[PDB]
Amino acid sequence: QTDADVIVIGAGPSGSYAAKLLHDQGVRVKLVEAKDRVGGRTWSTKSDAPGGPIDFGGQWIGETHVLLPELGAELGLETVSSVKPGNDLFVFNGDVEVGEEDQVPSGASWAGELSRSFELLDEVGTRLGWAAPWASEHVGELDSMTVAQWLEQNVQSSEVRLIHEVMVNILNGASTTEVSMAYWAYFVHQGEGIESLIGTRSGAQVAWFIGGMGQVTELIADKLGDDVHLNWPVTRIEQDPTGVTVFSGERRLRASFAILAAPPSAGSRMIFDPPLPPKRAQLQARAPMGRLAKIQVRYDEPFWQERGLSGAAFECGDLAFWLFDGSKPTDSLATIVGFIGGKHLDAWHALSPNEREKRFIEILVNNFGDKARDVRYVHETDWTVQPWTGGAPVTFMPTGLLSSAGSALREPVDRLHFAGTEAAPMWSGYIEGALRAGKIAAGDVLARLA
Amino acid sequence: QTDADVIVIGAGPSGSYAAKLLHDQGVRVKLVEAKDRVGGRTWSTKSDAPGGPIDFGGQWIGETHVLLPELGAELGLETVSSVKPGNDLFVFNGDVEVGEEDQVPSGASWAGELSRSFELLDEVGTRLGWAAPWASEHVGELDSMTVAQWLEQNVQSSEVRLIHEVMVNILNGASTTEVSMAYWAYFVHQGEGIESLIGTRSGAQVAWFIGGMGQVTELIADKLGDDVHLNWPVTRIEQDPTGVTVFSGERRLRASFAILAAPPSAGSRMIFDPPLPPKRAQLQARAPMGRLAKIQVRYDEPFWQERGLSGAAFECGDLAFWLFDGSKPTDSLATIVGFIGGKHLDAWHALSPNEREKRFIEILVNNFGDKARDVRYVHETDWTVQPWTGGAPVTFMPTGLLSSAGSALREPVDRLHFAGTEAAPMWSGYIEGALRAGKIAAGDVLARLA
Numbered sequence: 001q002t003d004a005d006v007i008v009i010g011a012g013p014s015g016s017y018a019a020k021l022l023h024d025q026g027v028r029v030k031l032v033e034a035k036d037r038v039g040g041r042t043w044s045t046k047s048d049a050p051g052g053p054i055d056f057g058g059q060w061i062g063e064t065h066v067l068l069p070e071l072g073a074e075l076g077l078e079t080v081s082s083v084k085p086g087n088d089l090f091v092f093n094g095d096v097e098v099g100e101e102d103q104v105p106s107g108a109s110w111a112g113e114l115s116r117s118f119e120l121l122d123e124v125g126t127r128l129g130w131a132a133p134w135a136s137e138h139v140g141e142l143d144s145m146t147v148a149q150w151l152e153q154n155v156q157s158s159e160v161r162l163i164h165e166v167m168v169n170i171l172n173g174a175s176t177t178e179v180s181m182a183y184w185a186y187f188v189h190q191g192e193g194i195e196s197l198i199g200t201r202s203g204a205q206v207a208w209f210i211g212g213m214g215q216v217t218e219l220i221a222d223k224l225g226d227d228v229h230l231n232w233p234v235t236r237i238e239q240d241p242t243g244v245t246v247f248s249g250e251r252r253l254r255a256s257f258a259i260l261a262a263p264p265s266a267g268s269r270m271i272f273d274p275p276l277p278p279k280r281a282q283l284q285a286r287a288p289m290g291r292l293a294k295i296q297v298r299y300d301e302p303f304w305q306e307r308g309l310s311g312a313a314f315e316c317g318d319l320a321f322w323l324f325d326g327s328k329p330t331d332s333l334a335t336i337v338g339f340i341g342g343k344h345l346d347a348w349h350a351l352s353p354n355e356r357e358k359r360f361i362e363i364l365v366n367n368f369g370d371k372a373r374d375v376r377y378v379h380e381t382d383w384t385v386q387p388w389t390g391g392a393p394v395t396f397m398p399t400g401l402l403s404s405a406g407s408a409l410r411e412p413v414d415r416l417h418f419a420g421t422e423a424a425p426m427w428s429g430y431i432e433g434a435l436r437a438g439k440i441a442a443g444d445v446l447a448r449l450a
Numbered sequence: 451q452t453d454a455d456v457i458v459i460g461a462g463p464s465g466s467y468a469a470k471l472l473h474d475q476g477v478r479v480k481l482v483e484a485k486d487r488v489g490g491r492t493w494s495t496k497s498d499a500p501g502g503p504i505d506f507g508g509q510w511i512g513e514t515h516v517l518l519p520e521l522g523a524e525l526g527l528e529t530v531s532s533v534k535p536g537n538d539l540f541v542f543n544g545d546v547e548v549g550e551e552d553q554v555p556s557g558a559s560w561a562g563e564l565s566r567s568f569e570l571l572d573e574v575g576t577r578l579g580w581a582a583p584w585a586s587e588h589v590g591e592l593d594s595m596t597v598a599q600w601l602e603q604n605v606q607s608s609e610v611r612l613i614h615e616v617m618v619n620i621l622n623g624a625s626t627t628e629v630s631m632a633y634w635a636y637f638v639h640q641g642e643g644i645e646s647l648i649g650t651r652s653g654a655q656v657a658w659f660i661g662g663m664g665q666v667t668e669l670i671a672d673k674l675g676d677d678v679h680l681n682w683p684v685t686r687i688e689q690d691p692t693g694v695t696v697f698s699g700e701r702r703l704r705a706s707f708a709i710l711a712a713p714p715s716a717g718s719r720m721i722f723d724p725p726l727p728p729k730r731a732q733l734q735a736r737a738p739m740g741r742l743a744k745i746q747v748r749y750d751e752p753f754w755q756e757r758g759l760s761g762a763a764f765e766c767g768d769l770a771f772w773l774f775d776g777s778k779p780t781d782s783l784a785t786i787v788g789f790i791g792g793k794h795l796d797a798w799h800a801l802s803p804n805e806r807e808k809r810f811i812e813i814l815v816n817n818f819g820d821k822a823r824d825v826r827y828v829h830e831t832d833w834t835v836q837p838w839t840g841g842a843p844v845t846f847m848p849t850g851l852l853s854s855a856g857s858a859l860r861e862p863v864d865r866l867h868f869a870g871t872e873a874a875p876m877w878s879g880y881i882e883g884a885l886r887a888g889k890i891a892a893g894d895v896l897a898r899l900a
């Protein structure tokens with residue numbers, strides 16, 4: 001006797017979407033979530049902050065994403081463009097260089113090597129591919145070196161190196177000395193290339209949902225009603241010839257199939273009986289979350305526009321950030337958003353909270369002008385302290401893992417299927433990947449139920 | 451109101467010893483253990499195997515270890531020498547070279563570069579030190595490269611490279627492409643140097659306890675009686691100004707202090723409230739267990755001695771092992787013990803159990819002669835599937851971790867103290883380190899109780 005046909009573990013976008021698809025087909029589903037809320041690495045509030053809704057986790061929609069906007073539309077959400085005209089900034093340890101709209105500064109001495117380094121990175125990625133990077137003839141060597149070592153071998157300009165360092169410390173939440181070059185190159189390729197991932201005008205970042213990205217999971221949970229269990233951290237998964245038992249301490253739920261819709265690192269904390277196969281066990285134990293914090297400051301007006309600036313800034317150096325204008329036309333205040341990750345976040349953490357806020361204000365003054373001092377609201381979200389997530393924005397891998405265990409990112413283990421964005425064939429790391437992986441897992445399980 | 455003065459988490463040698471020391475001073479202690487047994491990575495049975503007691507985990511005592519033999523003596527255990535005279539073997543993808551007792555084969559073409567590579571490794575280790583390797587001026591660069599890269603830069607002989615590869619895959623349970631060179635060099639230095647760790651006649655491996663190493667923890671548990679809780683996996687630690695609450699699901703225990711006597715990876719599965727400081731959180735998430743299996747075959751007699759062989763073999767190559775004669779004079783059968791780790795264990799795992807046993811017998815026949823076919827008993831212990839341990843023999847670290855978070859190996863966090871062998875100033879990775887770290891944590895907590 002079963003409590004459900006399928007138990008879905010994790011109510012982020014991936015698990016919420018898989019549960020929704022199954023429920024929509026009349027499958028009996030339980031969606032169990034460790035935290036006191038749904039959303040996972042997406043998290044927002046319509047009213048807790050002055051000036052309008054605010055997002056604490058992932059919030060941007062890409063121009064080639066389709067599951068995400070279609071889901072949003074189906075749930076009744078409206079999008080607004082996130083694109084910010086004006087001159088983007090490239091800042092090198094406080095020395096500000098002004099782009100031409102989203103392009104490099106006029107006559108920048110580093111533009112040529114930057115373009116060549118991006119082409120080289122894309123070529124490494126293409127040699128690995130998204131379908132099966134672990135099977136590529138080039139992966140063993142690439143997976144035995146770090147991104148930092150690849151930069152040392154292929155980049156000479158300090159500006160280009162610092163741009164690549166901020167890219168990795170942000171988009172993988174980890175230092176170039178920590179991330180396998182094979183993993184990084186695969187990650188960028190399967191996100192449709194480097195221009196896709198760093199473009200402010202076209203690429204993976206062009207729109208937002210009015211009201212916050214957290215709505216997506218909340219609305220799904222609304223419809224699932226009592227089949228959602230919050231405060232239900234899974235501690236053990238047992239399998240047998242006729243189904244799967246999922247435990248939270250002594251609490252238990254029985255089903256025919258289960259879907260793990262959380263990062264490999266989340267699986268590593270669970271006990272499996274029988275034990276998982278070796279590649280999946282190693283993957284869960286050795287693919288950590290990156291580390292990332294998201295600092296937001298609100299103002300009466302987007303005063304950076306007085307200097308003809310977009311508010312986008314690649315703030316490179318010892319305390320590197322990515323900064324953007326996060327303001328929506330329907331907000332009553334303007335918002336600047338700063339992200340800091342990896343080794344830069346390690347440095348940020350070594351400062352006091354007061355020193356951090358003062359340092360960020362000084363960066364905003366340097367980049368955007370003195371009116372940055374007239375703050376209305378300041379907020380920091382440290383993803384490394386969020387229970388049952390423990391980091392951000394994505395999973396990364398150190399040397400040796402992708403080539404020796406990456407095939408376990410997607411393969412089911414008997415009656416346990418894997419969703420979560422890390423399992424997506426493309427757009428792993430992104431909400432779109434969460435949704436694609438949830439769709440795949442739901443389809444596979446539905447086929448086994450028929 | 452408290453259940454105990456101190457809660458010790460983990461009943462391996464470290465936590466058992468810390469609980470014992472506290473209890474001996476009249477402190478009220480609880481020792482809580484996740485598994486259905488005490489011992490952790492030590493594990494033995496007096497009677498389940500034909501031919502005498504057998505050890506499934508760590509069992510050797512070193513010549514400079516003192517807490518371990520003194521504890522054994524205090525508990526009523528007797529030691530016996532483990533040293534095996536005869537010619538040790540150095541095997542390179544099946545080509546057997548016969549040592550002169552424990553020394554390299556007469557006139558070996560690789561002897562000179564081997565000695566130089568060992569001296570070089572010791573010198574790297576000495577540059578880092580055991581007291582505070584994370585503070586050494588040399589650690590950032592060393593921690594940004596792998597052991598494999600250091601070998602590529604400093605070793606040319608294939609024999610010497612393969613010897614170093616088996617050393618790392620066994621002693622850290624991980625590939626040379628996975629382990630930070632800084633971590634490996636520090637690990638060897640703090641184990642008193644490479645000759646200490648690989649010597650068959652003098653060094654870290656000279657004696658055993660008759661009856662099995664598991665006795666150490668079992669006897670301690672006997673005296674602690676009902677203050678030991680088995681099947682009590684800690685899932686959450688909460689701290690406040692007056693003490694610490696430790697949870698296993700909904701079950702809870704309250705004390706004034708707690709000691710975590712388990713690897714950083716064990717801590718990563720727990721929820722901490724308040725959250726741990728950043729360096730400790732990163733250390734727990736990013737310092738994995740190595741991977742290791744221990745295969746044992748019993749025979750009527752140590753027939754390898756018919757060829758003048760000790761039974762020790764460094765079996766190098768694609769499927770590398772360390773082999774030793776594990777026979778005690780009081781056993782009624784002879785025992786050969788094989789260890790396989792890291793990338794070699796990955797290969798081992800890709801074979802069927804039957805193919806593994808046949809392959810091991812073929813290795814024994816090649817190395818020691820045809821009588822290896824006349825088996826009496828065969829047993830494998832795969833440490834990667836042991837619940838709440840998940841690997842062996844030790845914790846390792848990938849690039850970037852020791853230099854950015856290693857200072858969190860030993861430092862208490864408010865009322866939570868860290869024991870476990872990884873916290874030992876010296877002999878981290880070994881039972882002696884477990885005991886030293888337990889002694890330190892017990893002393894610190896006792897001082898806070900007075």
Ligand SMILES: Cc1cc2nc3c(=O)[nH]c(=O)nc-3n(C[C@H](O)[C@H](O)[C@H](O)COP(=O)(O)OP(=O)(O)OC[C@H]3O[C@@H](n4cnc5c(N)ncnc54)[C@H](O)[C@@H]3O)c2cc1C
Binds near residue numbers: 388
């Ligand atoms: C600051 C930040 C900014 C980001 N920006 C963007 C952006 O602009 N665009 C983009 O596309 N993506 C962005 N992301 C990434 C996006 O948030 C993730 O890709 C996405 O949320 C992945 O969804 P998921 O469902 O796979 O996993 P998650 O969102 O991590 O959900 C996993 C769920 O599993 C739960 N869980 C974990 N362990 C257990 C357990 N033992 N038992 C039960 N439940 C458990 C967790 O609590 C969580 O709710 C951002 C992320 C962060 C942190």
Ligand SMILES: Cc1cc2nc3c(=O)[nH]c(=O)nc-3n(C[C@H](O)[C@H](O)[C@H](O)COP(=O)(O)OP(=O)(O)OC[C@H]3O[C@@H](n4cnc5c(N)ncnc54)[C@H](O)[C@@H]3O)c2cc1C
Binds near residue numbers: 482506683839843844
């Ligand atoms: C095959 C093998 C051979 C070895 N050979 C040797 C040798 O010859 N010499 C040597 O000196 N060392 C050897 N060792 C290493 C030695 O076993 C370890 O150094 C030692 O056991 C470390 O002791 P510990 O108490 O620090 O940790 P462990 O022995 O790992 O004990 C940790 C304990 O914590 C428990 N625990 C974990 N998570 C939780 C939780 N959430 N709640 C409650 N309890 C929890 C575990 O179940 C375990 O009992 C060997 C190890 C292996 C695997």
Ligand SMILES: COc1ccc(CC2=NCCC3=C2CCCC3)cc1
Binds near residue numbers: 339
């Ligand atoms: C080039 O401009 C942008 C603007 C916004 C984002 C959103 C985003 N997506 C992936 C995860 C992450 C971020 C932003 C910062 C840190 C982590 C990305 C590129």
Ligand SMILES: COc1ccc(CC2=NCCC3=C2CCCC3)cc1
Binds near residue numbers: 648649
């Ligand atoms: C040079 O001879 C030996 C013999 C025995 C051991 C015991 C030992 N201690 C550290 C952990 C570990 C082993 C042995 C194999 C694998 C892992 C070491 C060296």
